[PDB]
Amino acid sequence: IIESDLERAEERAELSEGKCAELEEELKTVTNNLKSLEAQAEKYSQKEDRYEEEIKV
Amino acid sequence: IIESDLERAEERAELSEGKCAELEEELKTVTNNLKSLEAQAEKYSQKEDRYEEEIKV
User: Fold this and answer.
1) C-alpha angle A19/B21/A30, rounded to 5°?
2) Would an 8 Å CB–CB cutoff place B26 in contact with chain A?
3) Do B23 and A27 form a contact (C-beta atoms < 8 A)?
4) Min CA distance, A47 vs chain B (Å)?
5) For residues A26 and B24, what is the distance between their CA atoms, to the nearest angstrom?
6) Helix/strand number for chain A, H first, E second
7) What is the 3-state secondary structure (H, E, C) of chain B?
C-alpha cells in the first residue's frame, strides 16, 4: 500500500514538479512578456517623458 | 524504507506543491502585473498620443 502510495507520491512529486516546470515556463513566459510589457511601458514612459519634455519645450 | 521514501516522495510532492503554489501565485501576480502593464503600456502609449496631441496643440 505504501509502495503503491510511494509510486503515487513519486508520481505526485513528478506531477507537481511537472506542473512547477509548466508554471516555470508559463511564469517565465509571462515574466519575459512582462519584461517586454514593462520594457514597453518603460519605453512608452521614456517616450512619454520625451513627449513631456517636448511639451515642456 | 518505503514509508520513508513515501514520506519523502510526499514531501517532494508537498515541496513541489509548495513551489507550485508559489509559482501559481507568481504566475497570477506576474500575469496580473503583466495585464497591469499591458494596460499601462497602453496608457503610456495613449500618453504618447495624448502628449503628441498636446505637443500638436
Assistant:
1) 70
2) yes
3) yes
4) 7
5) 9
6) 1, 0
7) CHHHHHHHHHHHHHHHHHHHHHHHHHHHHHHHHHHHHHHHHHHHHHHHHHHHHHHHC
Please state how this structure was obtained: cryo-EM
- In this structure, chain B runs to a length of 57
Residue of A45, A49, A53, A56 to mutate for B, most B C-beta atoms under 10 A: A45
Residues of B in Cβ contact (< 8 Å) with A15: 13
Query: How far apart are alpha carbons B6 and A13 in whole angstroms?
Result: 10
Nearest to A11 by CA among B12, B40, B24, B21: B12
| Single-letter amino acid code for the residue at A28 | K
At position A37, the amino acid (one-letter code) is L
